[PDB]
Amino acid sequence: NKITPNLAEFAFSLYRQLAHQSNSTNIFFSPVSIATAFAMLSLGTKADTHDEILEGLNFNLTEIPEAQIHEGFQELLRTLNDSQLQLTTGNGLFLSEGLKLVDKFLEDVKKLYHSEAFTVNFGDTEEAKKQINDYVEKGTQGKIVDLVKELDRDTVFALVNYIFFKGKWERPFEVKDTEEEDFHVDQVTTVKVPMMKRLGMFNIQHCKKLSSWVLLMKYLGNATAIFFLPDEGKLQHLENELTHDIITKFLENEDRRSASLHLPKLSITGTYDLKSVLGQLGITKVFSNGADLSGVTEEAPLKLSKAVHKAVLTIDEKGTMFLEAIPMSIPPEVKFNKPFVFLFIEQNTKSPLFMGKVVNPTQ
């Protein structure tokens, strides 16, 4: 898994920037789906436009060959796309119908990255926006609606990237045990949220280096959820100390201990303007009039005017008979009833499927 360290650093860079934009909103995004879409876009770019994209995905081009970058993304798409992981992801390229497209690019999009490319009359902005939104709604079975709200008048190329995940816990909660509990949005304020609870044997530990409880729970399929519960006043310290090697140590641990876990039910979405967010990471040329997109079309100028990512997560008790031996001893009460951070990891590749922060489940 040669590109896994780069995906992890891209996940942290992308998280740390969003955490700086707003500190009072829930965060949820797919680092893998965003990186895949732009690694695929780089196939149609050249020169500085190409180099900026891969460097913005935390790939040092003086160290890793491009053949290994695309090989890693292709292998990751194979495992994700049989699986019990109820993961639906899609990437849509919408190009002006007047453009003469390069066949090599359209082939690479479908054959290698299993994505979709469409022609659209951007001379009718309202109809172009309706066709883009009907594509995402059909691909999500109605979960994501009216994704694109506006299009620039000179739009000739738009990119949408969507992903929805509803996992099935390997060791599930009991619906009868879910009850309304306090969630401490700050140190003196609470709100009532639906809270799942179960007594079991967990991959859980209090990490001194992170000043947080670290809980790992396995989904059906090859994906593991990692939840970080920071100690009092240690949320920012937790966000600063997260490194990929720290995640690797957690995933390798096989020790289990008893705990009374309280975990909120979550229905969370995240919608992000990738032109703005990735521009803060150094990806600017492909969104500008100077973009080298000669691998997509050769004669006419081309720039990516619109790029949107939306991610939807649902966490529930079951999602659709392991028996754990519980010792005769007081189990610690681990309650995710205050702001926490999480990261979902694909088991085979160790790649960060999702990352987010919950500041208020019902916000």
Swiss-Prot record:
Name the gene.
SERPINA1
The organs and tissues expressing this protein are described as: Ubiquitous. Expressed in leukocytes and plasma.
Q: Which disease is it linked to?
A: Alpha-1-antitrypsin deficiency: A disorder whose most common manifestation is emphysema, which becomes evident by the third to fourth decade. A less common manifestation of the deficiency is liver disease, which occurs in children and adults, and may result in cirrhosis and liver failure. Environmental factors, particularly cigarette smoking, greatly increase the risk of emphysema at an earlier age.
Q: Where is this region: RCL?
A: 319-338
Instruction: Quote the protein name from its UniProt record.
Output: Alpha-1-antitrypsin
Glycosylated residue positions: N23, N60, N222
Which PROSITE patterns is this protein grouped with?
Answer: SERPIN
State how it assembles. Interacts with CELA2A. Interacts with ERGIC3 and LMAN1/ERGIC53. Interacts with PRSS1/trypsin. Interacts with PRSS1/Trypsin. The variants S and Z interact with CANX and PDIA3.
